[PDB]
Amino acid sequence: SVTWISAGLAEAGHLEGHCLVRVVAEELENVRILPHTVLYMADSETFISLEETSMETALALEKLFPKQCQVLGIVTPGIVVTPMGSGSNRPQEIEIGESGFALLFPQIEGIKIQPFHFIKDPKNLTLERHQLTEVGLLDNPELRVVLVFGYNCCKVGASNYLQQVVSTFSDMNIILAGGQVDNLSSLTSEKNPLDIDASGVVGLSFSGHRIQSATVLLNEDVSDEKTAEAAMQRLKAANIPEHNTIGFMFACVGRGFQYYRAKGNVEADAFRKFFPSVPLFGFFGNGEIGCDRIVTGNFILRKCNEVKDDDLFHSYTTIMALIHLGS
């Protein structure tokens, strides 16, 4: 069973210390499973102390977690998270404001998860072949879900770096998900002191024999409650099982309070309107990755997308996912 720990807005203690670090200190004492791989996100005001400091907050969380555990550290401008307890908690959509969650993945038989990281270059090659085999993005007959993230894509070339790096391991029967974020905090590779100024691509690469998935795009055609509920009804028709699934929602900073008229927690409420007990975790970012595609043990529903690859990099949109981790 996957277990999640989050830090809500109701704990804005006026004392020196990160909110998330405080919760992860108290809650890890009562945790029940042994974490193996962990994915944690936090908002982009809780990793700055002077102008950036970043290590102090980062290594703090990198210390409590077990040495053998694998940690990926990603910071986004906005956290959308389900609180602790059961799977029936109403999701809370947090714009600017200190919040964050940590996902604890235990040792699950037959499912193997491995982080990956491709740093950018001043002047070098792109990716010869082996980094896709070192981690497993290629030549893996059971790769079914990937969670590509990107950071510091502002500079030219770096914006096109995400264009180039994805195409190397695309075109398979896999699900892409994620987008562009601000910066990285901590990665457990034990061979590189992390450089805050450098850009790159990081993420998880789910792999197994029972990992089912689902994905729905939310284009500029959805602008009210009824249209949003119609889109998530399509997700329900995929017959993705209920138990042992975790949901993701990657959206744009231009969507939320401003885009849909004077409302919030609208995507989150519709998710639990049709899906009765699945949790939800996702970030707000400046970029979108995804398409319409369902991959399960039997069927694949790719989009013919015959132009080149113009079905992945959207903007001003929202992507969902229904990663059925386990069976």
């Binding site: 399509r234 997700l235 028709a237 995929a238 017959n239 319409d292 369902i294 039997n298 529903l301 013919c304």
Partner: protein, 122 residues
């Protein structure tokens, strides 16, 4: 000392060879009419791929049987379906969805699920 061989490519190639035999009429022993556009296939393949060509295909002789389908099914929904019956790949398009889904229940072709279709944007 039973090692037992297992080939992950022995089924796809057999079903592609069946398609190639279908295309250039290499031992096609069944002719089927839909409206009027003659189609050719294999008796054995359709005897197991669907569950209506298993009740209107058995209990016959070696003489070629020419089965016909009513107007309730058309050719816009069959050509997608019989090509999936041989290549395990079913192309969908805007005008295809309704008729290609309506074809399934009258045939109850196996290993295809008619609930995933209500997910496409189109």
């Amino acid at each position: 000392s039973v090692f037992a061989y297992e080939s992950s490519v022995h089924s796809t190639n057999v079903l592609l060879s069946l398609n190639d035999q279908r295309k250039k009429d290499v031992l096609c022993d069944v002719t089927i009419f839909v409206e009027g556009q003659r189609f050719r296939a294999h008796r054995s393949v359709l005897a197991a791929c669907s569950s209506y060509f298993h009740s209107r295909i058995v209990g016959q002789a070696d003489g070629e049987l020419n089965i016909t389908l009513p107007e309730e099914v058309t050719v816009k929904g069959f050509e997608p379906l019989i090509q999936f019956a041989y290549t395990a790949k079913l192309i969908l398009s805007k005008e295809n969805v309704d008729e290609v889904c309506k074809c399934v229940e009258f045939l109850s072709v196996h290993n295809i699920e008619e609930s995933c279709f209500q997910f496409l944007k189109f």
